[PDB]
Amino acid sequence: LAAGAVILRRFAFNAAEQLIRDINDVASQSPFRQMVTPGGYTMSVAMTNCGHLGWTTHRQGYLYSPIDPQTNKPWPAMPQSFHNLCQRAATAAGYPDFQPDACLINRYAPGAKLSLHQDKDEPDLRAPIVSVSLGLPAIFQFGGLKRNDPLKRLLLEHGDVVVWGGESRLFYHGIQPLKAGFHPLTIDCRYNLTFRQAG
Ligand SMILES: O=C(O)CCC(=O)C(=O)O
Ligand SMILES: [Fe+2]
Numbered sequence: 060l061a062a063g064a065v066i067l068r069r070f071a072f073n074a075a076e077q078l079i080r081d082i083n084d085v086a087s088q089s090p091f092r093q094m095v096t097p098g099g100y101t102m103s104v105a106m107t108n109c110g111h112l113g114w115t116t117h118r119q120g121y122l123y124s125p126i127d128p129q130t131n132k133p134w135p136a137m138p139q140s141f142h143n144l145c146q147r148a149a150t151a152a153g154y155p156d157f158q159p160d161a162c163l164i165n166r167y168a169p170g171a172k173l174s175l176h177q178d179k180d181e182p183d184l185r186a187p188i189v190s191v192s193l194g195l196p197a198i199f200q201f202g203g204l205k206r207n208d209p210l211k212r213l214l215l216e217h218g219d220v221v222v223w224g225g226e227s228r229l230f231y232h233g234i235q236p237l238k239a240g241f242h243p244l245t246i247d248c249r250y251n252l253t254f255r256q257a258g
């Protein structure tokens with residue numbers, strides 16, 4: 060059970076093929092790279108962005124930047140398929156006003172994980188985050204306000220869209236090591252799109 064979170068399973072099933080074609084298109088301008096945390100450690104999850112702003116690691120910490128620090132060019136524009144799905148998802152969740160300007164694209168190879176963290180780099184915490192899962196299934200784990208808070212698990216499969224609004228927006232969360240397997244559309248990985256209001 061989650062407060063403020065609206066889970067729309069298999070919502071992105073029909074849009075899925077075009078989203079993957081558009082992830083590949085975004086990836087040809089801003090390649091997938093495994094970002095280095097401020098402490099000097101490379102993340103197992105490969106990331107890239109699209110939209111006006113993009114989430115990235117820096118020496119001083121985490122920030123949103125209109126420039127890709129690797130290519131030194133701006134991030135690719137948010138694809139229309141991305142805009143359309145997020146809009147329909149947010150409207151179905153009770154957020155018709157949500158206008159994202161950043162989309163963090165995560166690629167999970169077999170065994171890739173994402174340790175517990177909070178999404179607190181956005182200016183307005185009242186605004187939700189629309190998450191779209193594609194490819195192989197992954198176990199999403201969420202806690203509470205603190206670190207040693209009781210963890211709950213959720214499987215996020217292909218096409219699943221979760222809108223993290225209300226209280227769930229500030230919860231500690233992460234992804235457990237991706238189980239090896241096969242998916243017809245992504246072959247051996249999982250993709251996750253997190254639409255954010257970063258400006
Ligand atoms: O992959 C997921 O479903 C979660 C991604 C996430 O929380 C993030 O990148 O900040
Ligand atoms: Fe996150």
